[PDB]
Amino acid sequence: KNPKSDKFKVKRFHHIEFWCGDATNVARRFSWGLGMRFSAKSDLSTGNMVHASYLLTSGDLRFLFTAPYSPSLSAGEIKPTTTASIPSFDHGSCRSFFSSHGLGVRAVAIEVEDAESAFSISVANGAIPSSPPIVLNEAVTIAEVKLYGDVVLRYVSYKAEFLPGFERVEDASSFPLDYGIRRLDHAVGNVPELGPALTYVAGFTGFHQFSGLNSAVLASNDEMVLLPINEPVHGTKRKSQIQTYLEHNEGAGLQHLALMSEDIFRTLREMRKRSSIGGFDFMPSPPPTYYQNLKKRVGDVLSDDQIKECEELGILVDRDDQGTLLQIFTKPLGDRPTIFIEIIQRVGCMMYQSGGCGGFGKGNFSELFKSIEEYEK
Amino acid sequence: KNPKSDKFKVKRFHHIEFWCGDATNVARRFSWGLGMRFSAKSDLSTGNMVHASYLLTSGDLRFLFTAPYSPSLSAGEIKPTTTASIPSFDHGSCRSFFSSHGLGVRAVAIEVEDAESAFSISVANGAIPSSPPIVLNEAVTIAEVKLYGDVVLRYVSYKAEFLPGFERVEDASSFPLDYGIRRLDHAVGNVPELGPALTYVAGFTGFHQFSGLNSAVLASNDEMVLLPINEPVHGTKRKSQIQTYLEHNEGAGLQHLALMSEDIFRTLREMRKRSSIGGFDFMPSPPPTYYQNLKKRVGDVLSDDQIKECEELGILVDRDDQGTLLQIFTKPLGDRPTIFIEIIQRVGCMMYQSGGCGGFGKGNFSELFKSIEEYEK
Ligand SMILES: CCCC(=N)C1=C(O)C[C@@H](C[C@@H](C)SCC)CC1=O
Ligand SMILES: CCCC(=N)C1=C(O)C[C@@H](C[C@@H](C)SCC)CC1=O
Ligand SMILES: [Co+2]
Ligand SMILES: [Co+2]
């Protein structure tokens, strides 16, 4: 049941912005670990005296890494005369965010038809404003509202390059890495209380509802923008990983980003080759019993060769009534046990592919526990 | 003339500590870009609730990357009950350092015979104390005094692993990268006023004296610990790069680290292969006229094949009366035009090799200007 109740026209995920202490080092690490190219910059060399911002791309996936310069470089500026390319940026906010949360996602950005209208309608419907609409070079409009914690939902709309003031990166500095990642599939928040969080966000967007935790997913009209939200469940034997997140993150924030691959086997081969030479580490693989049990569940979708390929790469498999999901999770991206990445590929629900085909892997809670007990043997 | 006036027994450079916002991402980037292995850690997985610290090694070179966790994780602790492995660490100091300077060197650490005695004698001779001697596990003593800006000189002494509380890194996470770097040759500070800086440091150590700037080098008795210091020269047509450093760094700090390679050609081949895939970029190469003029200066030390190999890698060559120096400089390591790295190899002054063989490249100021004018042609 999709009531198509979006209060404004949403298109697709546009970009994710990380707030960093040093954007250069984080962007270089992510580029090598994920196979994303350097594609745009806004920094001192482009006349930005306020913040350093570096854009990585893989397919339609856009990761932005931003860090503040010394406020002394821009002490003479006022907002009307700013050299910042992202007018919502604030030195104090950025330093406070990073000191409080460490490395993490500041903005989940979605492309909309009219960012000024989306902002107005959102705020009229309960959204807490964060940055009012600003028109950039008469070409792009950006606005921001609070999503959860210190994470903002950023609206971007184009009348017709990434943003005005960003320069394309010289091909010499731009090496064409590509491990197969193509777009953001969903972005997941952790909050202390799921009920109020859902009511707030669904309140101002009109998005509809699509062990250790309770969870729910908000979706846009075509269900291509997907925003799951988790809350902890207290009292269990093993401490809730959602609660661990909230403690180490100092409150609510973005938990994980799910990146769709057009060939998850190639992506995971390439990422695992680089885990120990600057890239990303992966969660421990499920036991061999999990992969023996895959024949009964998905033996009609994957060959036995494709199933053993899942086993050597540590990939998880789940299935609902509509499609099948291949997924795997990285270890945390930074010092704190907070944000991590999921790599996914979906098979089925062809019409293009419909959003959320195969679900989000909820069936792997019981399947992993069963395989861990069965492999104890 | 070496008067051998060290006021305490100094051995060698021991390690360099960077203060970071996220130690994981910086350490992974540096490991891949420089070919250093992950060798020790102190973090949540080792029981450290205060800071995340990761040690990289190449030969005798030790780079330490440290970042603070949320102070809430350790709110119940006091110094007597701390889980920090580096007792001098302070959340407030680290956050203030990184907000003020961005990514940079906090500590230049030297091994001494007795850190408690070196601290006492230093402070008795004008050193500004930073952290008093602390004995770790009855095995290692650490103490710190101010060097310049917010950089400290750290004394380390061993009675007989890196530091107590650090754990060796599991070989799976430890990939044996090595591009040929073997030790720290010298570490260079930028200050507003050279005279007072020299008087202060030479005052408390007893170290002896060994365009756009004035400079001088302080050295230990065997001249294996080398600490050059720069000051700007104002008024020139081209603005002093020392002054640019001080503005973007918000004052004095460490300008560059010079890393000795046992095979600079191999090091530069390996580093240049990775410049655009997560590693480090290099300053623009000198014109071909510079390399034509190399035959007259060093044609008796390097073959013409070895000289063309310098040319394809962009290596600089200088020579004093005692030896010859091969060197090259990276672009800045992070967002700000502040800290960078020099790769060097020295030929000559065999006895072992004496410290500072070939100087520091001062002759390349005139040689580059001459080659740039000659190549204008
Ligand atoms: C926020 C909820 C939506 C969502 N994205 C989500 C996840 O990705 C994690 C899945 C759990 C197991 C795969 S974890 C064991 C390796 C289930 C799930 O529901
Ligand atoms: C602090 C001074 C000691 C020192 N380390 C030092 C440097 O490394 C830079 C050298 C200058 C040219 C190579 S720069 C043009 C590429 C000269 C020099 O004196
Ligand atoms: Co997910
Ligand atoms: Co040097």
Swiss-Prot record, chains A, B:
Main location: cytoplasm
Catalytic reaction annotation: 3-(4-hydroxyphenyl)pyruvate + O2 = homogentisate + CO2
Compartment(s) of residence: Cytoplasm
Residues forming coiled coils: none
Any GO molecular function: 4-hydroxyphenylpyruvate dioxygenase activity
Any GO BP: tyrosine catabolic process
Family: Belongs to the 4HPPD family.
Protein name, as recorded: 4-hydroxyphenylpyruvate dioxygenase
Gene: HPD
